[PDB]
Amino acid sequence: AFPSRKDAFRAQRKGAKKHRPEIIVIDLKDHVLGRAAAVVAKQLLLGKKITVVRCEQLNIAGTEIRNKIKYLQYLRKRKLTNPTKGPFHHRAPSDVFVRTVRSMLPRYTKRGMKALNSLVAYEGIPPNVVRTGGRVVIPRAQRHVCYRSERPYTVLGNMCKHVGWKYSDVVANLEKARVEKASRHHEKQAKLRDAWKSARKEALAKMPKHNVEVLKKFGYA
Amino acid sequence: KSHYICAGRLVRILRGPRQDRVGVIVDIVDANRVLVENPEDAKMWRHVQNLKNVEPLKYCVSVSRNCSAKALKDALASSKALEKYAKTRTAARVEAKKACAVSTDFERYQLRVARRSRAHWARKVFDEKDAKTPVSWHKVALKKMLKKAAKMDSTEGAKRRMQKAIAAR
Amino acid sequence: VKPHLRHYQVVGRESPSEKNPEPTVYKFEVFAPNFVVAKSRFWRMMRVKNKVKATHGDVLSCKVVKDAKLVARNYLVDIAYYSQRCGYTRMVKEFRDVSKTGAVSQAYHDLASRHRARYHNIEVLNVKSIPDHEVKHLSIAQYHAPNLSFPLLQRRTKATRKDRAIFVKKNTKRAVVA
Amino acid sequence: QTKQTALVRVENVNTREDATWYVGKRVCYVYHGKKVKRCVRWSKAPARRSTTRALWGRVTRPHGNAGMMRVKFNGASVPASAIGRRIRVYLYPSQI
Amino acid sequence: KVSRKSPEYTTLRKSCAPGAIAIILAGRFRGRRAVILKQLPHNGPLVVSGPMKYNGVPIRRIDSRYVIATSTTVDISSVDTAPITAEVFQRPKAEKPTLVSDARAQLQKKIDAALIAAIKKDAQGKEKAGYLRSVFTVKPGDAPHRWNW
RNA sequence: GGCCAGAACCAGCCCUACUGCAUUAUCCUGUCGGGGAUCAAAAUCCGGCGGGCAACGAAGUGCAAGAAUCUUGGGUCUUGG
RNA sequence: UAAGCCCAAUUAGUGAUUGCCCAUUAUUCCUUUGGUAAGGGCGGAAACAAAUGGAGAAAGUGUAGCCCUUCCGAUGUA
RNA sequence: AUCGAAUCGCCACCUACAAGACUGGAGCUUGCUCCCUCGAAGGCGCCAAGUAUAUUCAUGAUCACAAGACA
Ligand SMILES: [K+]
Ligand SMILES: [Mg+2]
Ligand SMILES: [Mg+2]
Ligand SMILES: [Mg+2]
Ligand SMILES: [Mg+2]
Ligand code: NA
Ligand code: NA
Ligand code: NA
Ligand code: NA
Ligand code: NA
Ligand code: NA
Known part of the structure; x- marks a missing residue:
C-alpha cells in the first residue's frame, strides 16, 4: 500500500516518472451479478488488472425478499464449534461481488490468488477512480439485455442494507456529491468542447480539397 | 425511432449472408418471421427473414400483403424510398464501412494523411480562436494571471530587478 | 431456419x-x-x-x-400422440407458416414443448392450407388483419460475430477488450 | 493437461477464421532471468546483452470457434510461470 | 519448364514482383516500406531498396517471408537492376579477427537515382513518395488478419 | 563444428479450395368459375381449361469418381532427405 | 432475453448434406519386444599402400542378437 | 546504488448522467406523415508541426527480446 522509503528512494535514483499499470475500470451499474462475475473472472485469469465501481448497483433476478432470504441462508452457515475461523459473511456489495468472483476462480492455487488480487472493488466511484479514464461496460451482462423487464429484480445495495451493511446512506450521499460535481464540470468545458467541434468544421475549408474527398469516401466528412 | 413492422416497411438485414441489405416486408407470417423482398437487389429475392435479423427503417411503400413482384417494383420506384434512403447518414456509413473493409495499404495510408491534415488545420483554427477568446486551460490560466502579474510588476522594485538581471543576460 | x-x-x-x-x-x-x-x-x-x-x-x-412457393399461409394440422396416462390424443391445430413441412415441423416442436411428445409417439393425420375465414383460433386469425403492424420491442440485438466485444466503453462503441 | 501444446489468445482475434490466418506464424515469450547469459549476437551486438530472454514457437492450428490458437514451442514446453503473461505473435513467415 | 539446377529457377509468389512496395516485417528496418527490385538467382532472397533518402533502407537482400508485398507498385523497367548480383553482397573471409565501399556506394547511388525518377514519373508519384516515407505499426485495436493489402 | 536458428527445395503423408449425373408435377404459370375480405380491391382458398424448366449461386434431394499438374493452397519442431 | 424443461440445428429460406473440446480407443508414423512368424544374402564380383570414402559379412534357438526386408501380437491376481 | 531486466496507446475533447415498452423535435390519424444537426463513429496518435519544394539513414551485411521506450 503506502510505499516504503526504499521504494521511494530507488525511484529518485532511477529518475523514472509516474507509472500507472493498464487497469480496466468497469461501471457495474445495472449489471447481472453472476454474468459480470463470470466475465470478470475469466479476464482476471488472463492477466488483466480490473477495477469495478458502483458494486452497490449490481442486479440479481427475482424479488428483493427472495434474495434477502438467500443471503440469510448463507449467513446461517457457520462453524458451530468455533464461529471464528468459520465462514465470513461480508455484507458490502463490493465484498459480495468479490466473493462471487472468488468462487469462480481456483482460489486455492497461487495462480488463482494472483488473479483475485488483481481485482479492486468499490461502492460508487471513489475520487481516485473518477478521472483515470473512460469506464466500460459488459454488454453481455447488462440488465436491459439479460432480463425480461416484466420480471422483478433486486439492486444489490438495497438487499445488502437489510442484512448488515451499514454504509448505504454514506455511499448514497457520496454518490450524490460525485454527480453534482461531475455535472458542474460538464456544464463547464462545454465552450471548449463546442470550440473543438467548430474547429473541425472550419478545418474542412482550410485543408486540401483532395484530402476532403478521401474523408468523404470513408465516411469522415 | 421504433418503426412498425408492416406490409411495405423497409428493413435492413442485421446479420447473416444478406447483412446490410435493404428489403420490403411484403408479408408477415407470425410474430417471428416476415417475407422480405427487394426487386432492385439481385440477392434479395422473396425470402423468409426472422424478425430478430431486420431493422425497420423510416420508409414504408404502399403495398398489400402478398403483393406481386411487379406491384412492389412499381411502388418502390414511385415512392422513391431507396433514393431517399441512400441520402441518409446511416446509409453513407454502411457504404463507408464497405470501403474500409476492402481498402488496401495505400488507401489506408491516404485516409491517415487526410485525418492528420484535418486534425492539423483544426489545431490551427482552434489556436486562432483561442488567442481571441480564451477557452483552453493555458489561455484561461494566462488571462487570470495577466492582471495580477501586471500589478506585481508595476512596482519600482520589480522593475529594477527585471532590468538588473535582464542586462546580465 | 429451414424445417428439420x-x-x-x-x-x-x-x-x-x-x-x-x-x-x-x-x-x-x-x-x-x-x-x-x-x-x-x-x-x-x-x-x-x-x-x-x-x-x-x-x-x-x-x-x-x-x-x-413461400407464402404466408394458415395450415391445419391433424395430429395425434400417445402417452401412457391418456392413450391416444388426437388434436387439430392451426399454424402460421410458409410451407407444409414448416407447419408440421412447428407442430412437432409444439407437441414437444406443450405435451412432452417425441417424434416416434406422434402420428400426423392431415396437413392442409386453409383460408382465413375457416380459422377458428383467435391467435391465428389475428394475422389476417389487412393492416397488421407492431413495433419490435424488448429486442436483444447481438453484434456481428466479427465485431463482438468483451468490454466496451460505457456510452461509446469503442471496444476495450475484443 | 498436456504441456507440449500451449493455448494463446490474441487481441482482436475472435473467430476461427481469424485464427487460421496466424497458422505457421512465429510466437515468442519474453521474460528475464537473474544473470546476464548468452544471446544471439553476444559478440556482434554487445548492446543486446541483458537478463532478457525469449522462448520461440509457432502457431500450429486454431482452438475452438472463438479465435484461440495452439502453439508449439521449439523443443521444450513453455513454463507454467508464463500463464497469464504476454505472448508476441509476429507477422512472419509472411504469406502475403 | 525451368530446371531446378538453373539460376533462373524460382518459386516466389506473384505478389512479390519487382516494383511492388513491401512492408519490412523483421530486421533493423522493420516497419519501413521498401521497393522490391529483383530476386537473386537460385531462388535467392529478394533485393529491396526503398529509396534510402525516403526511409533510410539501403540496397539490402531480404527473405520473402519477412516482407508483406502490397498491391501498390512502381514501374521499375527503367531501373537497370542488372548490376545487383549475388556477388555484390559477398564478403571476404575473416582471418584472425558508417563504412561503405566505393562499389556499394556507387551502386546504391545509381540505382536509387533511377528509382526516384521512376516514382516521379508515376501518377500519384507524390502520394507514393510519402507512402514510402510512412512507417507501418501494429496499433491497439488493429486486425491485420482482416485486412487487404 | 556432432551447436542454435531461418529459409529454399525433394519424396511420402495429413488438411482444405475447385463439381458433375440423376430428380422435381401434392409444383410453376396464364385464364375462366366459385369463394373471400375490403371504402373498392388484391391476396390466403377450392375447381375446370391452355402451356410448362421455379433452373444450375433453382432445390438445404439421391449419388458424386472433380490428377492442388495445368491453375506456385497449407502443414510436417508429427517423417526422412 | 437461463447457464432450467421438451424438441431441433451447425454459422442458417443463401444457394446442400464434418461447429467445437477432451481417452492408454481408431488411423498412421518412429522405436522395443515375442512369434505356430514370412522371405532374401552368406562359393568374399572386379579393383583399390602410407605420407593424404570407412568398416563389417558368424549356415545362425538364446549374445553387443550373422546381416537386411516384411507382417502380426504386447495390460493381468493365484 | 547495486539495477541488466518482463510490460510497448496518449489526451487538459472519453475520463458527467439517465433510458432501452426508447432520450432529435413536432402533428394527429397513434402508426403514419413532416422538419432538422437525417438519429450506426470520444478526439487524437501510426515518421515533413503537414500533404508540398523537401531531407541523414547502409557494413547492425537475410529471422533472432525493439540493438530502444518520458508520445
Ligand atoms: K523383430
Ligand atoms: Mg463444527
Ligand atoms: Mg434464386
Ligand atoms: Mg505379461
Ligand atoms: Mg530489449
Ligand atoms: Na470477500
Ligand atoms: Na469453484
Ligand atoms: Na416480436
Ligand atoms: Na415484447
Ligand atoms: Na546361435
Ligand atoms: Na512390431
Missing part, C-alpha cells in the same frame, strides 16, 4: 407371391428427417394396418415432395 422435417411420399407393396400375384400398391405421406426414417415409418404403417412386413414387401419410390 421433409415431405416424403413412400410407395410400396407386398412382394408378389402365389397367394397375391398382383398386390395392392400403397402411397404413404410422412414427414421425416431423412428417407431411412421415412421408409421405417412407411413399413410401420404397412405392418399395423395392412399386415405387411418390411421383409415381405418392396418399396416402389421414396422421393421428396417439392414445396410450394
Whole structure:
C-alpha cells in the first residue's frame, strides 16, 4: 500500500516518472451479478488488472425478499464449534461481488490468488477512480439485455442494507456529491468542447480539397 | 425511432449472408418471421427473414400483403424510398464501412494523411480562436494571471530587478 | 431456419407371391428427417394396418415432395400422440407458416414443448392450407388483419460475430477488450 | 493437461477464421532471468546483452470457434510461470 | 519448364514482383516500406531498396517471408537492376579477427537515382513518395488478419 | 563444428479450395368459375381449361469418381532427405 | 432475453448434406519386444599402400542378437 | 546504488448522467406523415508541426527480446 522509503528512494535514483499499470475500470451499474462475475473472472485469469465501481448497483433476478432470504441462508452457515475461523459473511456489495468472483476462480492455487488480487472493488466511484479514464461496460451482462423487464429484480445495495451493511446512506450521499460535481464540470468545458467541434468544421475549408474527398469516401466528412 | 413492422416497411438485414441489405416486408407470417423482398437487389429475392435479423427503417411503400413482384417494383420506384434512403447518414456509413473493409495499404495510408491534415488545420483554427477568446486551460490560466502579474510588476522594485538581471543576460 | 422435417411420399407393396400375384400398391405421406426414417415409418404403417412386413414387401419410390412457393399461409394440422396416462390424443391445430413441412415441423416442436411428445409417439393425420375465414383460433386469425403492424420491442440485438466485444466503453462503441 | 501444446489468445482475434490466418506464424515469450547469459549476437551486438530472454514457437492450428490458437514451442514446453503473461505473435513467415 | 539446377529457377509468389512496395516485417528496418527490385538467382532472397533518402533502407537482400508485398507498385523497367548480383553482397573471409565501399556506394547511388525518377514519373508519384516515407505499426485495436493489402 | 536458428527445395503423408449425373408435377404459370375480405380491391382458398424448366449461386434431394499438374493452397519442431 | 424443461440445428429460406473440446480407443508414423512368424544374402564380383570414402559379412534357438526386408501380437491376481 | 531486466496507446475533447415498452423535435390519424444537426463513429496518435519544394539513414551485411521506450 503506502510505499516504503526504499521504494521511494530507488525511484529518485532511477529518475523514472509516474507509472500507472493498464487497469480496466468497469461501471457495474445495472449489471447481472453472476454474468459480470463470470466475465470478470475469466479476464482476471488472463492477466488483466480490473477495477469495478458502483458494486452497490449490481442486479440479481427475482424479488428483493427472495434474495434477502438467500443471503440469510448463507449467513446461517457457520462453524458451530468455533464461529471464528468459520465462514465470513461480508455484507458490502463490493465484498459480495468479490466473493462471487472468488468462487469462480481456483482460489486455492497461487495462480488463482494472483488473479483475485488483481481485482479492486468499490461502492460508487471513489475520487481516485473518477478521472483515470473512460469506464466500460459488459454488454453481455447488462440488465436491459439479460432480463425480461416484466420480471422483478433486486439492486444489490438495497438487499445488502437489510442484512448488515451499514454504509448505504454514506455511499448514497457520496454518490450524490460525485454527480453534482461531475455535472458542474460538464456544464463547464462545454465552450471548449463546442470550440473543438467548430474547429473541425472550419478545418474542412482550410485543408486540401483532395484530402476532403478521401474523408468523404470513408465516411469522415 | 421504433418503426412498425408492416406490409411495405423497409428493413435492413442485421446479420447473416444478406447483412446490410435493404428489403420490403411484403408479408408477415407470425410474430417471428416476415417475407422480405427487394426487386432492385439481385440477392434479395422473396425470402423468409426472422424478425430478430431486420431493422425497420423510416420508409414504408404502399403495398398489400402478398403483393406481386411487379406491384412492389412499381411502388418502390414511385415512392422513391431507396433514393431517399441512400441520402441518409446511416446509409453513407454502411457504404463507408464497405470501403474500409476492402481498402488496401495505400488507401489506408491516404485516409491517415487526410485525418492528420484535418486534425492539423483544426489545431490551427482552434489556436486562432483561442488567442481571441480564451477557452483552453493555458489561455484561461494566462488571462487570470495577466492582471495580477501586471500589478506585481508595476512596482519600482520589480522593475529594477527585471532590468538588473535582464542586462546580465 | 429451414424445417428439420421433409415431405416424403413412400410407395410400396407386398412382394408378389402365389397367394397375391398382383398386390395392392400403397402411397404413404410422412414427414421425416431423412428417407431411412421415412421408409421405417412407411413399413410401420404397412405392418399395423395392412399386415405387411418390411421383409415381405418392396418399396416402389421414396422421393421428396417439392414445396410450394413461400407464402404466408394458415395450415391445419391433424395430429395425434400417445402417452401412457391418456392413450391416444388426437388434436387439430392451426399454424402460421410458409410451407407444409414448416407447419408440421412447428407442430412437432409444439407437441414437444406443450405435451412432452417425441417424434416416434406422434402420428400426423392431415396437413392442409386453409383460408382465413375457416380459422377458428383467435391467435391465428389475428394475422389476417389487412393492416397488421407492431413495433419490435424488448429486442436483444447481438453484434456481428466479427465485431463482438468483451468490454466496451460505457456510452461509446469503442471496444476495450475484443 | 498436456504441456507440449500451449493455448494463446490474441487481441482482436475472435473467430476461427481469424485464427487460421496466424497458422505457421512465429510466437515468442519474453521474460528475464537473474544473470546476464548468452544471446544471439553476444559478440556482434554487445548492446543486446541483458537478463532478457525469449522462448520461440509457432502457431500450429486454431482452438475452438472463438479465435484461440495452439502453439508449439521449439523443443521444450513453455513454463507454467508464463500463464497469464504476454505472448508476441509476429507477422512472419509472411504469406502475403 | 525451368530446371531446378538453373539460376533462373524460382518459386516466389506473384505478389512479390519487382516494383511492388513491401512492408519490412523483421530486421533493423522493420516497419519501413521498401521497393522490391529483383530476386537473386537460385531462388535467392529478394533485393529491396526503398529509396534510402525516403526511409533510410539501403540496397539490402531480404527473405520473402519477412516482407508483406502490397498491391501498390512502381514501374521499375527503367531501373537497370542488372548490376545487383549475388556477388555484390559477398564478403571476404575473416582471418584472425558508417563504412561503405566505393562499389556499394556507387551502386546504391545509381540505382536509387533511377528509382526516384521512376516514382516521379508515376501518377500519384507524390502520394507514393510519402507512402514510402510512412512507417507501418501494429496499433491497439488493429486486425491485420482482416485486412487487404 | 556432432551447436542454435531461418529459409529454399525433394519424396511420402495429413488438411482444405475447385463439381458433375440423376430428380422435381401434392409444383410453376396464364385464364375462366366459385369463394373471400375490403371504402373498392388484391391476396390466403377450392375447381375446370391452355402451356410448362421455379433452373444450375433453382432445390438445404439421391449419388458424386472433380490428377492442388495445368491453375506456385497449407502443414510436417508429427517423417526422412 | 437461463447457464432450467421438451424438441431441433451447425454459422442458417443463401444457394446442400464434418461447429467445437477432451481417452492408454481408431488411423498412421518412429522405436522395443515375442512369434505356430514370412522371405532374401552368406562359393568374399572386379579393383583399390602410407605420407593424404570407412568398416563389417558368424549356415545362425538364446549374445553387443550373422546381416537386411516384411507382417502380426504386447495390460493381468493365484 | 547495486539495477541488466518482463510490460510497448496518449489526451487538459472519453475520463458527467439517465433510458432501452426508447432520450432529435413536432402533428394527429397513434402508426403514419413532416422538419432538422437525417438519429450506426470520444478526439487524437501510426515518421515533413503537414500533404508540398523537401531531407541523414547502409557494413547492425537475410529471422533472432525493439540493438530502444518520458508520445
Ligand atoms: K523383430
Ligand atoms: Mg463444527
Ligand atoms: Mg434464386
Ligand atoms: Mg505379461
Ligand atoms: Mg530489449
Ligand atoms: Na470477500
Ligand atoms: Na469453484
Ligand atoms: Na416480436
Ligand atoms: Na415484447
Ligand atoms: Na546361435
Ligand atoms: Na512390431
